[PDB]
Structure formats: C-alpha cells, structure tokens
C-alpha cells in the first residue's frame, strides 16, 4: 500500500501532562511548575520507553502556549554534539529577545543529552548561567553519569524509574478501549511481561499482535514476541543437574538460532546480577563464563564450549 497509518506510539503519544501514567510525584511537580511558571533547569534520566521526552515536550507546550514555535529550540544532542553548536546556535537562541507571558521563559530541549562531547558540555556551563533570566535549559538522557558533574549542579536532578505493570496496563486498556481491539487478560499480562516496563515496547508489541493476528491472546503474543533471552539463560544457569542445563541450551538457545557470543554475554550479565547465589560462587562462574567468552571472541564459537562452560559451572556449584 502506497500510504501508511501512524504508529500507535506516536498517534497516542500524550499531549498533556495528565496522560502520563508513571512517576506520579515527578509528573505532579512538573504540572505545578507548568501552572505556576518559572521552570528550573533539569536533567531527566531513566530507562528507555518510560516517558522522558514526552514529559519535557508536554511541559514545554503547556508552559509556552502558542509560543512553542519560537520559545522552544529542538536539538537532538546526538545529532548536534559539537562545541560549534553551543557557540553559535544555542548562544544566539539564548541572547534572542522574545516577549513571553510573565512566568514563562524560553526552553531548550536537548534530547539524548548523554552523547554530548566534553567540549560542548563544558562550553554550555557559562551559557546556562549567563542567560538564565531568559533561557531555561532542559536535558533528557538515558544515563546521567555521562553528563559532567558541574552541569548536573546547575539543574534539578529529576530521575525516573521503570514503569509499574499497573500503569502500563492502564495505558494499554485506554488505548484498547479507544481503538476497539479484542483482547484477553492473559494476552495483556504477557505483553506487559515482555515489555518489562518499557511502554514503547508494550505499544509496539500490541500493534504487531493486532495487525498480524487480530486477537490479543497469550499464544499469539508469544509467537510474535519471543520470551526474554535473560530468563531462559538464567534458567539454564540455575538448573539443578548438568543434563538439564544441556537440554535447555540445545532446545531453547542453539536450535532456536541464538549465537554463542549472545549466549555468553547474556550469561555473564545474568550471573553478575544474580542474587540467590552467593558472591564467591557467582564470581567463579563469572570466571568460567569469561574464559568461554575469550574463546568465542578468539573464534572458537561452538556448542562444545558452551557445554563445557555449563559443565564447569555445575562442577563449581557441586563442590
């Protein structure tokens, strides 16, 4: 078909701050700031798909009213991460004179701010303070650690958290009711489980299920969206017997098409994040997994090395 329909993530992107479901304290604080005015400098950080860009965009829209065209400067940090940007474009926008409602000021939105280079970030330090009376900067990034500490000092540290299953279920139910989709409770629960708090993943998976099969049922959602790799990897690592681990590997990972490097990397990540196993045993399994990773990266990527790694882990656990 020549034309396409808009995705549900962008078509149903919240246009007001109330539609945002998660992080109730932060959303209420941003709504109070929007009503009262005098927006402070901030960095918004968290996981992908929990509503950081949407929150800042709704805040800017509501704060600036009809003046969003001029008062808002949109600059994807990854696209424009040079000191030249700060020297010319950001500085000229900050020195720009614009008549606004009393409380409100001009807003700079720098999405994906974690990718800004050191030079541009350091140059922004004085632009943040010199033109603060007229210009207010806003930062959105996946990881706040990439942003230098002095820049974090000048702004409010507003930190987001992974979306709870209840809020994702509420948003999914709202979209389902609005667009008349047939669903089952098991299917919605499975979509929430696969999303793992990423609302964007949940909505994309709902779109895929609806378009492909037409009914939101557990069977369809599992065929169209596979079970999360770390869970099968953890089940393989935490099996009681060696033969069980070998069987889980052969069936779920090797025969299904997962690569050796992916398997070993996910095993390392799961092992480092495991909590039931004591730290010493966890560390020695990490050692064995790292040896297997070294062999795979040197070029020996085979079922034999993965089985040997499982055998070493089981020997380590069996004392």
């Amino acid at each position: 078909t020549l034309s396409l329909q808009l995705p549900w993530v962008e078509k149903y992107r919240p246009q007001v701050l109330s539609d945002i479901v998660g992080n109730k304290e932060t959303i209420d604080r941003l709504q109070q700031i929007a009503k009262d005015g005098n927006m402070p400098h901030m960095i918004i950080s968290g996981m992908p798909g929990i509503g950081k860009t949407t929150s800042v965009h709704c805040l800017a829209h509501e704060l600036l009213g009809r003046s969003y065209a001029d008062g808002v400067l949109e600059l994807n940090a990854s696209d424009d991460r040079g000191i030249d940007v700060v020297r010319n474009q950001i500085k000229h926008f900050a020195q720009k004179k614009l008549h606004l409602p009393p409380g409100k000021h001009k807003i700079v939105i720098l999405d994906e701010a974690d990718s800004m280079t050191a030079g541009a970030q350091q140059a922004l330090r004085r632009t943040m303070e010199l033109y603060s009376n007229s210009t207010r900067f806003a930062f959105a990034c996946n990881q706040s650690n990439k942003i230098i500490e002095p820049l974090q000092s000048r702004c409010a540290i507003l930190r987001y958290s992974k979306l709870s299953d209840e809020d994702v279920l509420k948003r999914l139910l709202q979209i389902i009711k609005l667009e008349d989709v047939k669903y089952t409770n098991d299917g919605l629960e499975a979509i929430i489980f696969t999303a793992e708090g990423d609302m964007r993943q949940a909505i994309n998976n709902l779109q895929s299920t609806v378009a492909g099969h037409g009914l939101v049922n557990a069977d369809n959602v599992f065929k169209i969206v596979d079970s999360p790799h770390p869970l099968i990897v953890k089940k393989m690592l935490l099996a009681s017997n060696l033969e069980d681990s070998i069987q889980i590997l052969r069936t779920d990972l090797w025969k299904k098409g997962y690569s050796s490097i992916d398997i070993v990397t996910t095993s390392f990540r799961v092992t480092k994040n495991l909590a039931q196993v004591k730290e010493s045993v966890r560390l020695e399994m990490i050692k064995e997994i790292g040896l297997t990773h070294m062999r795979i990266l040197e070029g020996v990527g085979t079922y034999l090395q993965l089985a040997s790694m499982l055998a070493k882990i089981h020997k380590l656990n069996n004392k």
């Binding site: 402070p40 409010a156 070294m294």
Partner: protein, 258 residues
C-alpha cells in the same frame, strides 16, 4: 538550593518523613578517585554476606568502571598490604594472596587481549572482575597501613629509559660485539666495568690511557660510560664506588677524553 526550589513546588513542608525519598532521588553519583576505589574495593564489609546485598556485584563492576586505567594497578599494588577478614576456615593469608595474584595474572592476560591489535573491548567487564573484584574479595579486610600509589608506572618509565640507554650502548658497540641488546647487559657489562671502572679503583689516574683505549675500541663516550656504570644491581652497585674515586682522577679523565 535547586532541590529546595524544585521540591517546594508540590510539598510545602520538608520534614523527617520524606527526607529519605528526597535523598534517594537527589544523591550525587560522583566517580570515586583512584584512591577511594582502592579503599572501598579493599574492604571487608563490602564483600560480607550482609554487605553483598547492600553493595552488589554490579556496583563493584561500576566502581571499577569509574577508573578503568588505574584500578587494576591500585589493587595489584595494595592487595597484599591489607589484613584479611573474609578468610575461609582453614585458609591463611598467604593462600588468599596467591589466589589473588593468580587472578591478577589472568586479568593481565585479559587486558593484553583487550589492549592489542584485536581490540576486544567487549571483554572489559571480564577484566573488571578478574583484575579488581575477585583478587580483592580473596584478600578483603581492613587496611593495615596506607593506600600507596601504583609503583608500576615509575618503574616502567625507568625500564624504558634504561632500555633506550642500553640500545644506544649496544648500537655503539655493535661493530665490536656480535651480541643482542639483552645479551650485552647480561654478560659484557660486568666485564666492561672491570675494564673501565676497576682500573680507576686500583691503578689510579695512570690507568686513564688504557680506559680511553678500551672506550675507543668500541666507540664509547663519557655518556656511554656513565650509562653502563648505572646498569648494575645488588652487590655490584657503583653509585657509591664512583663517588669514592678522587675528583682529580675524574677531572683528568674528562679533560683527557676531550
């Protein structure tokens, strides 16, 4: 001040009831300096059963990742200067030190693999574990003395300087001697001392001519002589020997060579 401004928009009374949530959301995550990483990584409470839940393994890996160029060196330099407190029943301090050193050897292998022509940077968490966390967990406890800085850097620079000097000396004497760079230091240098420095020790200022003949036989200079006199170790150190040589002898040697 920014926290006070931002919080006060919604909550008008900051009290002891919400101080915990305010602190947990506004805490500064500042990268620890390579000394605080050494202190915290070499701590018994961190690797304890209770401490493991509070400070998880991923936190330890991130603590490494704060400084990925100095933590392996700091742990290697200060893993055997701590009083252990996590020793297994039937394990002494020396056994834990040996296991930790084995782990640092594996971590050095991993680092060489990462920092070579292959550039296997995906093994960086494995290096974090092998270099910092496992060796420190083996010898975790209380700091006996002070946390010293890595001595490997200065000794490596000294080794590079001495290798440059040995290269110059070997290439000067290449025509005379059919040797390699290492073999010269291994074998000839002790005899070169006996043919250069000992005559000044026994014959006196009259052995200057023979010494000059020896240097001219292999195209050596005063700088070459000084560099060879700085190459010996242990019993054969010449730092005090050259001082005890009369200043007249050294001055006459310099003037005669010039």
């Amino acid at each position: 001040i920014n926290l006070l401004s931002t919080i006060s928009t919604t909550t008008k009374t900051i009290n002891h009831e919400n101080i915990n949530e305010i602190s947990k959301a506004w805490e500064k995550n500042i990268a620890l300096k390579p000394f605080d990483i050494a202190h915290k990584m070499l701590d018994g409470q961190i690797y304890s059963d209770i401490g493991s839940r509070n400070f998880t393994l991923n936190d330890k890996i991130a603590l490494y990742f704060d400084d990925f160029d100095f933590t392996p060196l700091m742990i290697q330099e200060n893993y055997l200067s701590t009083r252990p407190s996590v020793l297994k029943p039937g394990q002494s301090h020396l056994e834990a030190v040996a296991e930790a050193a084995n782990c640092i050897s594996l971590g050095d292998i991993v680092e060489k693999k990462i920092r070579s022509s292959e550039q296997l940077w995906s093994l960086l968490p494995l290096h974090a574990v092998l270099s910092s966390v496992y060796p420190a967990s083996k010898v975790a406890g209380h700091m006996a003395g002070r946390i010293n800085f890595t001595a490997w850097l200065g000794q490596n620079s000294k080794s590079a300087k001495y290798y440059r000097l040995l290269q110059e000396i070997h290439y000067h004497t290449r025509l005379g001697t059919s040797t390699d760079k290492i073999g010269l230091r291994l074998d000839y240098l002790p005899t070169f001392r006996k043919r250069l420095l000992d005559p000044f020790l026994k014959q006196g200022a009259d052995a200057i001519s023979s010494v000059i003949e020896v240097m001219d036989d292999y195209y050596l200079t005063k700088e070459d002589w000084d560099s060879i006199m700085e190459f010996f170790v242990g019993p054969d150190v010449t730092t005090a020997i050259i001082k005890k040589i009369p200043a007249t002898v050294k001055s006459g040697f310099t003037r005669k060579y010039n």
